[PDB]
Design a protein around this nucleic acid. Structure first.
Lengths: 94, 144, 203, 196, 257, 140, 85, 214, 90
RNA sequence: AAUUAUUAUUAUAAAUAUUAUUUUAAAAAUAUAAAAAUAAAUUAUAAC
RNA sequence: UUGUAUAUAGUUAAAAAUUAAUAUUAGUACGCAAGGAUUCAUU
C-alpha cells in the first residue's frame, strides 16, 4: 500500500548466465499495489560505486527477488531518494 | 474483489484467502475500512450503524447488508460483506493462535538471540579494531 | 503567459499580476508601470541631528580603516536600531552630512575610511558624555518600578491567596445554589458544615 | 519522486509480510491455497422478483417464511442470499449475473428447455432482480431411491421449481402463495461454479 | 512488437476508441475527484468548451455552477451543458460528503460563499435517495440566433422534496427577473427558507432605485453607440421598477408583518 | 541582510512585500508630529507620513511621523526638495535653508512636499526575512 | 500570511478570490474588530499544477518560519496532548 | 469523540459533551491499522470567546498552573466549555497569539507553568469580571436568605490571616466535589453548525447550552 | 530538513584511535609463519612454492613504497586472510 | 492617426469603488507558447 | 580451421526493427446524453 513498500529492502538474485546477480536495494514504486500481472518495483539497489535504479516486471522466472519490511521505514526512503539525486545530478560529466 | 461486479464467484474466495500472508496484522478487531472495496463512504454508512470491526461485518443478517446497499445508497455492499464472511474464520484462528510453523519456536529465539550477538560486533569493531591497534602501537613504543 | 494560462491560478501569480494603485498595494508593478501611474514618491532620507547622534559616538569607539561599507556593519551591530534610513544610501548619506558642516574628514590608506574625526573629537567626548550617563539615569527610574514591582507580587502575594479565597466565596454558595435543585440534604449540610466546621475556629 | 514528502511523518509500520523468511511463506500459503475454502455456500434456487429491490425490503421476510413452509423444513433453516438487482440493460446480452432473467434459459424452465429446441427466441424478461436460497452445508446432487425422487440441494431446488411452475399454470400451495402474496415470478437452479 | 506499434507521442482522434496500452505520462491532478479540471475530447474527460484559456475555462465553469445553485436551472450554450451536468453532480457528490473539508473544497470553487451553504443544506435532504446523475440536461428546441449554438436547459432533478424551490415553475421567467418566480398554483402560501430571501430582498431592492433606472436607460445609449440594433432610444424607455407597479407584488406580502 | 555571499535579488535588487511578519510594523499608541506636535490617527488615514528608518527615533517604532501639512521647512517654510530634510534643533529644517544656503523659494510647490503616506516613503530599507540569521527554520 | 495589528490567521488562494488577496477585512483573533488584514506571506496553491506534484507551489520561506514560530513549540505544549486526540 | 477510536477504551471525561453525539459502543478487540491511523484527521474544536474567557477563568484563579492542573481544574466549575484534553491544547495555541498567556518553565523544576502576561493581566480581569459580573448574582440559594452567607461572611477575612491554606485544603475538592454530582446532572452541549465567512474560509458557529439531563 | 546529515557527519568525527599501525616490527614475521603453516594445509590445486614467493614479494613491495596506514592495512589484510580461512586460494 | 481602429493624447495632481464589450462540440501545417538532458540567470525544442 | 597449405578456407544459421484490402440501404444534434460500464438500484 504505497506507503508500506517505499524504502523497504530488496534481495533480488536475477539468474543470468555467468552467475546470478546477487544485489540488495531499496524499493521505491510498487506500480500495482496488488498481485496483478503488472507488478513493477523500481528499486534503487546501490550495488557498489555504481548506482543503478531499475525495474522488475514481477512475473519473470529468471528475474526473482524478495522484499523485506523491517528497515523499510518510509523515513529511510526519503534519504535513498536524496542519495540517488546526488548520484544522478553529479554524474552528468559537467 | 473491488474490480468484481455484482456477484462474488466461489473463486475469488481464494484470491481473498491466498492474500492473507501479506496481511499479518489483520485480525477480527481490524477496522472495517480494511476490506476489499470498503471505501470511504460505505464506512460512514457502516459506522452510523455501530459496525466497526471485520467481526461484526460477518454478523449482518443479509438484511442489514441489504438495507445498506438498497436503502442507505452505499454501493458494492455485497462484495465487501462476502469478504469478511470469508476471512473471519481464518482470522478467528489468529485470535487463539499465531503461526503454526512460524515458530519454529526453538528457532525464533536463536534468530533473536544472535541478533544481539551480531549487532554488538560492529559496535565492538569500533573498539576491537583500535584497542588491538593501541596494543600493537604500545608493543613498539617500548622496543626502541 | 503560462502562469496566467494554466487553469489553477497560483498564489505568486495573484500577487505578481497586481499593478493596482490603491494604498498598501503591490509596489513593484506600481513602480514597474508608467511614470504617469506611479505615486511612488521620493525616499524620505533622514539627515537629522539624531543621525549625527549615532555618528560621533561610534567613530571614537573604532576609528580605523575602511569605514564606508562595514561602517553599516556597526549599524548592524550597534543596534538599539541602526541609523541609516536606507542602509544602502543613507549610510552613504552619513559621510556627506559629516563631510559638510565641518564634522568628519576621510582617511585613505590602501582604501578609504572615516578616521581622524576632523578636529571635532572634543564634541565627541561631550557626546558620549550624553550617552551612558543618560542611559544610566533612565534605567533606574524603571527600577523604581522594579523596587515596587517586587511588591507588585508582594502586594498581591496576599491578595492572590485572598482573592482566590474569594473565588470560592461565590462558588461555595453556587456549589449549593445548584444543590438546591438536586437535594442531597446530607452531602448538602456537610459541604456547608465542613467549611464552617473550621471557619469559626480560625480567628 | 511522485511520493510527497511527509506522506508517512511517523510510521509504526504494519508488517505486510508474515515471517520475512522467504521459505516459511509459500508454506503458510498452502493453507489458504490448498486449505479449505472458507466462505462458500451452495445456492438451492433463484427466486426471481419482478419489482426492484426497494419493493421487497419489507416483503422479503415472508418469502423465507414461505419457502420454509414449502420445503417443510422450518424457518431459520434457510439462508436467502441478499437481493441482487440486475443491470438496467439496453443491449441485453445474456449469461452474466448482472443480467435480467428471460422467461426461458438453462434453469429458468419448468424443466421445459425443449422450448429452446422448438422455439426461435426467448420469452421476455420476468425478473429484473433476483435472490438466492441456501441451507446448512451438505451434498450437491444425487438421485435417491428413498424419497421417490432426488433429495439433495438441486433436488430441494428442482423439486421446488417444478412445484413453482405449477402456479403459473392456473398438499402445499406455498408455491401458490409465493406467486401472489409474496413475490416470485421466476425460479432457476444455477450451475455449480468451480475454483482451482 | 515489444514497443507499442505507436509510441507515447501520437494524438488519437475525437470519438476514437480506448486502445489500451501501458503508458506513464498521465494524471495531472487528483483526477476523477469532484473538481478534476481536466478538459479534452477523449471520453475520460470533460468536453472543453470554447474559452480563452484554461484558467478562463475554470472561471466560466465556476460562475456557471454558482448560477445553478441560486436558480436550480440554467440555460447554457454548446459544450457548457455537458460540462455542467457533469459538474452539477460533482457538487452534489460533494454535498453528501459534508466533511469539514468539503465546504472548504467548495468554498474554493464557487464565487459565492453563501450558495455553498444552500448547496450543503438542500442537497443532502434532497438527493439522499438518488444514486447519481443528479442534474437534468434538456436540450431546447431553440438556438441563440447570434451564434448558432444549441441552448441546453440544465437543471437539478428532485425538486419536490426540495427546500427553497419546493413548488417553483420554470416555463417562463418572472415578470422582472428580481421577483420570486412563478409558483405551482397548488402551493401559494408555501414557506420558503427565511434566509434565502434575506439575500434576495437585500438584492431585489437595488433595482428599485432611481439610479438603477439611470443605468437601465444609459445602457441603451451604450448599446446603440456600440452598434447593437433594435435598442429603442433612451428617451422613450419605461422604467424597470416603479412604485405603483409594485403593489401587484405587494399582493402576497403579508407573511411576517 | 547577510544573505550568504551576495545572494540577494537579481533584477530589482529587492522584492515587493517581503514577508513582514517578523516585525509587525505597527503605528505607535503615543505619537507626535515631528515638527508641529499633533496627535496622529492610527492606520485608516493618509494624513500622516511614516518615516520607518533602520534606526528608530520618534514613537515606540520611532520612525518619524509628520502631518501631511507639517512636513514643510521650519525657518524657510517651504516644501523640502528631494525629500532629504535636516532636523535642526529638534525641528526638520529644509536642507538648503538650513545649511546656510538661504534660499528664497522652490520651483514646484512651495507649501506641500512630495512625501508618501503610510510607510510608502521608505520601502527600500531592509526588513526582509534573512535580516537576522533566522536559521531556526532549518536546523534539526 | 495575512497579518494586521491584532493577531493572525491562515487563508488560501481560491483563484476566484483575488481582490481579497492583498487586503481582506477579517474578524481579528483578538477581542473584536473587523480588521483590514494585509498580505504578508505566500502560502502555496489551492489546486494542483498541471502534471506537477502537490509540492510545486511551496508555501513560502517565512511561512515555514511562521508555523515553526507560531505553532512551532509542540515541545512547549506536549501537555495534555500530542498529535493524537 | 468515541469510546476507543484514537485513545484506548476507558478515556472518558466528565466534560461538555457535544449535542446529538451518542456514545457509540466500540467492541473491545477493535484496533486501527498503523497505516490507517496515518491521516487521523479530526473535527476542529471551537476556540472562540466563550472558551477563551473560560480558559482564562481557570488560569485567572491560578496565575501559575502546571501540566495536569491545566485540565484537572476545568473539572472544578459549574459550567465547562471543553470536551477533551485536546480542546484544552487547541485554545492554548490561540491564547498565545492573543497575548493572554505566556507560560514558561521554572528552571529549578522541570514542568511548564502558566502565566497571564503582565502586558495584558490588568485588562483580562475585566474579561474574567464580565463573566463574574453576573456569575455571583444569578446564584439561586444566594438570594434565599442571609444566614447561609452570614454563617460564612466572617471567614473570608480570618482565613487568609492564620488559617490561609487551612481552608484551601478543602476549598479545592469538597466545594467542587458536588459539581461532580452536578456534572452528572447538568453538562453543557457544544451544539455547532458549519458555515463560511465572506472571505471564504470555513468555520463553525457554536450554540452552547447546559444539558438538562437530570 | 536535510542538514541532518550535517548533524550526522559532524557527529561521526568519531576519533576512536584506529590508525593502522604500520608494523615496523616482528609482527610481520608472525603471519609469515602463520600463513605458510595455514596454507601448507590447503594448497591442493595451486602450487605450494609459487605461493611462498608471492607472500615474500608482497612483504617487500608493500614494505618498500607504500604509506603507513596502508601497511597497517596490508598487515591487517594478512590477518583477515587466514581469518577468511584463506584468500580463497585453493 | 480616413474610423466607434495597434492608443492612459498627461502640463499637472494623485491612491484599498468588482464602476461594466469579445462568439464558436473535432483533424493538420503553421503562429504564440511549453514537465525531462550533452552555480548563474541563458540555450536549442522544428517535443506534452 | 575441416578442404588446401604451413597457414588456414568456403558454405548456412543467432544478433543490430515494424507488418496494411475501394464505392449496394432512407442522414442538416454530442459518432460521448459525456465524469471511458451501452441506463447498477429511483428522482
Amino acid at each position: 500500500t504505497k506507503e508500506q513498500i517505499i524504502g523497504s529492502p530488496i534481495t533480488c538474485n536475477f539468474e543470468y548466465n555467468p552467475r546470478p546477480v546477487r544485489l540488495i536495494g531499496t524499493v521505491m514504486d510498487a506500480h500495482t499495489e496488488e498481485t496483478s500481472i503488472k507488478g513493477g518495483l523500481k528499486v534503487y539497489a546501490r550495488s557498489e560505486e555504481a548506482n543503478m535504479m531499475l525495474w522488475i516486471p514481477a512475473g519473470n522466472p529468471k528475474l526473482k527477488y524478495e522484499v523485506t519490511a523491517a528497515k523499510g521505514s518510509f523515513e529511510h526512503y526519503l534519504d535513498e531518494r536524496s542519495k540517488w539525486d546526488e548520484a544522478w545530478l553529479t554524474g552528468r560529466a559537467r | 474483489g473491488i474490480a468484481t461486479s455484482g456477484r462474488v464467484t466461489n473463486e475469488d474466495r481464494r484470491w481473498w484467502l491466498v492474500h492473507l500472508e501479506c496481511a499479518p496484522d489483520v485480525t477480527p478487531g481490524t477496522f472495517v475500512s480494511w476490506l476489499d472495496c470498503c471505501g470511504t463512504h460505505t464506512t460512514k454508512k457502516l459506522i452510523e450503524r455501530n459496525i466497526w470491526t471485520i467481526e461484526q461485518v460477518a454478523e449482518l443478517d443479509s438484511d442489514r447488508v441489504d438495507e445498506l446497499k438498497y436503502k442507505e445508497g452505499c454501493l458494492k455492499m455485497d462484495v465487501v460483506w462476502e469478504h469478511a464472511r470469508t476471512i473471519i474464520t481464518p482470522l478467528k484462528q489468529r485470535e487463539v493462535s499465531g503461526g503454526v510453523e512460524s515458530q519454529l519456536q526453538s528457532r525464533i529465539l536463536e534468530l533473536r538471540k544472535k541478533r544481539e550477538l551480531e549487532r554488538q560486533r560492529e559496535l565492538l569493531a569500533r573498539e576491537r579494531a583500535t584497542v588491538s591497534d593501541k596494543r600493537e602501537e604500545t608493543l613498539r613504543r617500548l622496543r626502541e | 503567459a503560462a502562469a496566467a494560462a494554466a487553469a489553477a491560478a497560483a498564489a505568486a501569480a495573484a500577487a505578481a499580476a497586481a499593478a493596482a494603485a490603491a494604498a498598501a498595494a503591490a509596489a513593484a508593478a506600481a513602480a514597474a508601470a508608467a511614470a504617469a501611474a506611479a505615486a511612488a514618491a521620493a525616499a524620505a532620507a533622514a539627515a537629522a541631528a539624531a543621525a549625527a547622534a549615532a555618528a560621533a559616538a561610534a567613530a571614537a569607539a573604532a576609528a580605523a580603516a575602511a569605514a564606508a561599507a562595514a561602517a553599516a556593519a556597526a549599524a548592524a551591530a550597534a543596534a538599539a536600531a541602526a541609523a541609516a534610513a536606507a542602509a544602502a544610501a543613507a549610510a552613504a548619506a552619513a559621510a556627506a552630512a559629516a563631510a559638510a558642516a565641518a564634522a568628519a574628514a576621510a582617511a585613505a590608506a590602501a582604501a578609504a575610511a572615516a578616521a581622524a574625526a576632523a578636529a571635532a573629537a572634543a564634541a565627541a567626548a561631550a557626546a558620549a558624555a550624553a550617552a551612558a550617563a543618560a542611559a544610566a539615569a533612565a534605567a533606574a527610574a524603571a527600577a523604581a518600578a522594579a523596587a515596587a514591582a517586587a511588591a507588585a507580587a508582594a502586594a498581591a502575594a496576599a491578595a492572590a491567596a485572598a482573592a482566590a479565597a474569594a473565588a470560592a466565596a461565590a462558588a461555595a454558595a453556587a456549589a449549593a445554589a445548584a444543590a438546591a435543585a438536586a437535594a442531597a440534604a446530607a452531602a448538602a449540610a456537610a459541604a456547608a458544615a465542613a467549611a464552617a466546621a473550621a471557619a469559626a475556629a480560625a480567628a | 519522486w511522485p511520493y510527497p514528502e511527509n506522506l508517512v511523518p511517523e510510521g509504526a509500520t504494519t508488517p505486510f509480510q508474515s515471517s520475512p523468511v522467504p521459505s516459511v511463506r509459500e508454506r503458510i500459503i498452502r493453507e489458504y491455497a490448498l486449505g479449505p475454502l472458507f466462505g462458500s455456500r451452495t445456492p438451492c434456487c433463484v427466486l426471481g422478483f419482478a419489482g426492484t429491490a426497494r419493493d421487497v425490503a419489507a416483503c422479503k421476510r415472508d418469502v423465507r417464511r414461505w419457502v420454509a413452509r414449502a420445503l417443510g423444513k422450518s424457518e431459520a433453516d434457510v439462508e436467502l442470499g441478499a437481493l441482487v438487482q440486475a443491470k438496467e440493460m439496453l443491449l441485453h446480452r445474456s449469461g452474466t449475473d448482472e443480467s435480467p432473467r428471460l422467461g426461458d434459459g438453462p434453469g429458468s424452465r419448468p424443466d421445459a428447455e425443449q422450448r429452446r429446441v422448438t422455439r426461435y427466441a426467448r420469452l421476455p424478461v420476468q425478473a429484473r432482480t433476483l435472490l438466492e436460497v441456501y441451507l446448512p452445508g451438505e451434498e450437491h446432487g444425487e438421485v435417491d431411491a428413498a424419497a421417490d425422487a432426488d433429495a439433495t440441494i438441486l433436488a430441494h431446488g428442482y423439486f421446488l421449481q417444478e412445484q413453482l411452475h405449477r402456479h403459473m399454470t392456473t398438499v402445499k400451495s406455498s408455491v401458490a402463495a409465493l406467486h401472489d402474496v409474496c413475490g416470485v415470478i421466476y425460479c432457476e437452479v444455477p450451475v455449480l461454479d468451480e475454483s482451482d | 512488437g515489444r514497443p507499442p506499434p505507436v509510441m507515447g507521442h501520437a494524438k488519437r482522434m475525437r470519438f476514437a476508441g480506448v486502445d489500451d496500452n501501458p503508458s506513464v505520462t498521465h494524471k495531472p491532478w487528483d483526477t476523477s475527484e469532484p473538481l478534476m479540471a481536466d478538459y479534452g475530447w477523449e471520453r475520460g474527460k470533460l468536453p472543453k468548451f470554447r474559452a480563452r484559456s484554461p484558467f478562463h475555462r475554470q472561471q466560466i465553469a465556476r460562475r456557471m455552477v454558482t448560477e445553478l445553485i441560486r436558480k436550480d436551472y440554467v440555460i447554457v450554450g454548446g459544450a457548457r451543458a455537458p460540462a455542467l451536468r457533469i459538474l452539477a453532480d460533482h457538487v452534489v457528490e460533494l454535498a453528501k460528503a459534508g466533511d469539514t473539508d468539503s465546504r472548504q473544497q467548495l468554498a474554493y470553487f464557487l464565487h459565492d460563499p453563501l450558495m455553498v451553504d444552500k448547496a450543503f443544506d438542500e442537497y443532502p435532504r434532497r438527493f439522499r435517495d438518488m444514486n447519481a446523475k443528479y442534474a437534468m440536461m434538456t436540450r431546447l428546441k431553440g438556438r441563440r440566433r447570434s451564434d448558432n449554438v444549441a441552448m441546453y436547459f440544465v437543471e437539478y432533478k428532485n425538486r419536490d422534496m426540495s427546500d427553497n424551490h419546493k413548488g417553483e415553475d420554470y416555463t417562463a421567467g418572472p415578470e422582472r427577473f428580481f421577483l420570486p418566480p412563478r409558483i405551482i398554483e397548488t402551493e401559494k402560501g408555501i414557506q420558503r427558507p427565511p434566509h434565502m430571501q434575506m439575500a434576495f430582498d437585500r438584492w431585489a431592492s437595488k433595482f428599485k432605485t432611481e439610479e438603477f433606472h439611470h443605468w437601465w436607460r444609459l445602457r441603451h445609449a451604450k448599446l446603440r453607440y456600440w452598434g447593437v440594433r433594435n435598442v429603442p432610444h433612451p428617451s422613450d424607455v419605461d422604467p424597470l421598477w416603479t412604485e405603483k407597479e409594485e403593489e401587484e407584488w405587494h399582493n402576497e406580502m403579508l407573511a411576517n408583518t | 541582510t547577510a544573505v550568504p555571499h551576495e545572494e540577494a535579488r537579481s533584477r530589482p535588487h529587492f522584492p515587493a512585500y517581503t514577508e513582514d511578519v517578523d516585525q509587525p510594523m505597527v503605528v505607535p499608541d503615543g505619537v507626535c508630529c515631528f515638527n508641529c506636535d499633533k496627535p496622529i490617527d492610527g492606520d485608516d488615514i493618509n494624513s500622516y507620513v511614516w518615516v520607518p528608518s533602520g534606526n528608530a527615533r520618534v514613537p515606540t517604532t520611532q520612525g518619524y511621523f509628520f502631518h501631511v501639512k507639517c512636513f514643510k521647512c521650519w525657518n524657510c517654510k517651504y516644501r523640502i526638495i528631494h525629500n532629504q530634510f535636516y532636523s535642526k534643533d529638534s525641528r526638520a529644517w529644509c536642507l538648503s535653508c538650513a545649511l546656510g544656503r538661504d534660499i528664497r523659494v522652490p520651483t514646484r510647490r512651495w507649501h506641500t512636499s512630495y512625501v508618501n503616506t503610510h510607510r510608502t516613503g521608505s520601502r527600500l530599507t531592509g526588513q526582509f526575512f534573512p535580516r537576522h540569521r533566522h536559521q531556526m527554520e532549518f536546523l534539526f | 500570511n495575512a497579518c494586521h495589528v491584532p493577531g493572525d490567521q491562515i487563508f488560501l488562494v481560491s483563484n476566484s478570490f483575488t481582490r481579497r488577496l492583498l487586503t481582506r477585512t477579517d474578524h481579528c483573533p483578538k477581542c473584536d474588530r473587523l480588521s483590514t488584514f494585509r498580505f504578508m506571506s505566500v502560502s502555496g496553491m489551492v489546486g494542483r499544477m498541471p502534471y506537477k506534484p502537490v509540492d510545486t507551489p511551496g508555501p513560502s520561506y517565512a511561512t515555514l518560519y511562521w508555523r515553526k514560530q507560531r505553532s512551532g513549540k509542540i515541545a512547549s505544549q506536549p501537555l495534555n496532548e500530542v498529535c493524537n486526540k | 469523540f468515541q469510546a476507543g477510536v484514537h485513545t484506548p477504551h476507558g478515556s472518558r471525561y466528565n466534560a461538555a459533551r457535544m449535542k446529538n453525539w451518542p456514545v457509540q459502543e466500540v467492541p473491545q478487540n477493535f484496533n486501527f491499522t498503523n497505516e490507517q491511523r496515518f491521516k487521523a484527521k479530526a473535527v476542529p474544536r471551537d476556540t472562540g470567546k466563550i472558551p477563551r474567557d473560560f480558559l482564562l477563568s481557570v488560569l485567572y484563579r491560578n496565575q501559575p498552573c502546571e501540566v495536569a492542573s491545566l485540565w484537572e481544574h476545568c473539572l472544578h466549575d459549574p459550567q465547562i466549555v471543553l470536551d477533551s484534553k485536546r480542546h484544552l491544547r487547541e485554545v492554548l495555541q490561540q491564547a498565545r497569539a492573543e497575548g493572554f498567556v505566556s507560560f514558561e518553565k521554572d528552571a529549578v523544576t522541570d514542568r511548564w507553568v502558566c502565566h497571564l502576561t503582565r502586558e495584558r493581566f490588568e485588562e483580562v480581569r475585566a474579561l474574567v469580571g464580565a463573566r463574574a459580573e453576573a456569575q455571583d448574582l444569578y446564584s439561586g440559594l444566594r438570594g434565599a436568605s442571609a444566614t447561609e452567607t452570614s454563617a460564612y461572611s466572617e471567614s473570608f477575612r480570618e482565613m487568609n490571616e492564620d488559617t490561609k491554606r487551612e481552608h484551601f485544603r478543602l476549598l479545592s475538592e469538597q466545594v467542587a466535589d458536588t459539581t461532580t454530582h452536578l456534572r452528572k446532572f447538568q453538562r453543557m452541549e457544544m451544539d455547532y453548525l458549519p458555515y463560511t465567512d465572506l472571505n471564504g474560509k470555513v468555520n463553525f458557529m457554536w450554540w452552547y447550552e447546559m444539558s438538562d439531563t437530570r | 530538513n536535510r542538514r541532518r546529515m550535517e548533524l550526522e557527519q559532524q557527529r561521526i568525527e568519531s576519533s576512536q584511535h584506529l590508525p593502522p599501525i604500520e608494523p615496523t616490527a616482528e609482527q610481520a614475521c608472525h603471519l609469515y609463519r602463520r600463513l605458510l603453516k595455514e596454507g601448507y594445509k590447503t594448497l591442493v590445486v595451486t602450487d605450494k612454492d609459487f605461493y611462498r614467493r608471492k607472500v615474500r614479494y608482497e612483504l617487500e613491495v608493500t614494505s618498500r613504497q607504500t604509506s603507513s596506514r596502508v601497511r597497517g592495512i596490508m598487515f591487517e589484510k594478512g590477518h583477515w586472510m587466514l581469518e577468511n580461512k584463506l584468500g580463497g586460494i585453493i
